[PDB]
Amino acid sequence: SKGEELFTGVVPILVELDGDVNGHKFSVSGEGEGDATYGKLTLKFICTTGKLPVPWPTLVTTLVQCFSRYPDHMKRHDFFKSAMPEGYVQERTIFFKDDGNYKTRAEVKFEGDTLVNRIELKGIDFKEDGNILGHKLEYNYNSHNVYIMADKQKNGIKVNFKIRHNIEDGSVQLADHYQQNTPIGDGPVLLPDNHYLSTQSALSKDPNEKRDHMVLLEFVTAAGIT
Numbered sequence: 752s753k754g755e756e757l758f759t760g761v762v763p764i765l766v767e768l769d770g771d772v773n774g775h776k777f778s779v780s781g782e783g784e785g786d787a788t789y790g791k792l793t794l795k796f797i798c799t800t801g802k803l804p805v806p807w808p809t810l811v812t813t814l815v816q817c818f819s820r821y822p823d824h825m826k827r828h829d830f831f832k833s834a835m836p837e838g839y840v841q842e843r844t845i846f847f848k849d850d851g852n853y854k855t856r857a858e859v860k861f862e863g864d865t866l867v868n869r870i871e872l873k874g875i876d877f878k879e880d881g882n883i884l885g886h887k888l889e890y891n892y893n894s895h896n897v898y899i900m901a902d903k904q905k906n907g908i909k910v911n912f913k914i915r916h917n918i919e920d921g922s923v924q925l926a927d928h929y930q931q932n933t934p935i936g937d938g939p940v941l942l943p944d945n946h947y948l949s950t951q952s953a954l955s956k957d958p959n960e961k962r963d964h965m966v967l968l969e970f971v972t973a974a975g976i977t
Contacts, residue, residue, distance in 0.1 A: 754835035758787035772874030775804035790820030828943035836861035837936030851877030907933035946975035
């Protein structure tokens with residue numbers, strides 16, 4: 752259909768986020784490409800304001816599920832691509848167990864041939880000595896599932912999942928994700944039956960990059976139907 756054809760090949764991606772966590776203001780700019788045919792994403796993010804005030808892994812989910820690979824038989828449940836090119840607003844509240852929360856609002860949409868994700872993040876109630884502001888999280892990311900449900904009231908979807916970040920001492924920092932996506936245009940979108948996205952992510956560093964940054968390779972596949 753409409754949006755779906757915009758993802759048949761490799762699409763360039765731009766990500767711009769402005770954040771404020773406990774008063775620590777920062778910005779991150781990202782660039783890369785997505786190839787939905789393979790549920791594949793490759794991007795490099797840079798903190799353009801200097802040092803990132805929270806650990807990079809805590810920003811991964813915030814930093815374009817329209818690139819998820821939907822098996823042919825599940826194509827009718829792909830809300831993400833169906834809202835394109837006009838796009839969707841993506842909002843979340845991320846609860847870090849025993850610590851603060853992030854609230855985010857982003858607009859995902861095409862600007863020409865480029866898929867753009869513009870984000871504002873607001874973090875409050877974090878402990879200065881916690882795992883986030885205290886930077887006690889490992890620079891890695893575990894595989895996880897993203898649960899999707901239709902939200903006919905908003906002509907969008909509701910999304911929930913849990914992320915477990917690894918703490919340096921071997922423990923785990925849980926981050927409970929509550930998400931809502933609603934179309935920007937007023938055209939029809941595909942409202943899905945309940946299903947999930949299986950995600951895998953690898954974090955690395957560019958050996959020649961001296962700015963605070965994050966290189967990310969990610970694979971995402973929808974599943975859970977027939």
